[PDB]
Amino acid sequence: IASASCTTXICTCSCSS
């Protein structure tokens, strides 16, 4: 339901490092 970089269907995913 939340994270950064890490799912397929709601909206987060990734975006740095």
Curated annotation (Swiss-Prot):
There is a cross-link at residues 5-6, 14-15 (Thiazole-4-carboxylic acid (Ser-Cys)). There is a cross-link at residues 5-14 (5-amino-piperideine-2,5-dicarboxylic acid (Ser-Ser) (with C-68)). The modification 2,3-didehydroalanine (Ser) is found at residues 3, 16-17. It is found in: Secreted. The modification Serine amide is found at residue 17. There is a cross-link at residues 10-11 (Thiazole-4-carboxylic acid (Ile-Cys)). Transmembrane segments: none annotated. There is a cross-link at residues 8-9 ((4S)-thiazoline-4-carboxylic acid (Thr-Cys)). There is a cross-link at residues 12-13 (Thiazole-4-carboxylic acid (Thr-Cys)). The modification (3S,4R)-3,4-dihydroxyisoleucine is found at residue 10. Belongs to the thiocillin family. Has bacteriocidal activity. Inhibits bacterial protein biosynthesis by acting on the elongation factor Tu (EF-Tu). This is Thiostrepton. It comes from Streptomyces azureus. The chain holds residues 56 to 72 of 72 of the full protein.
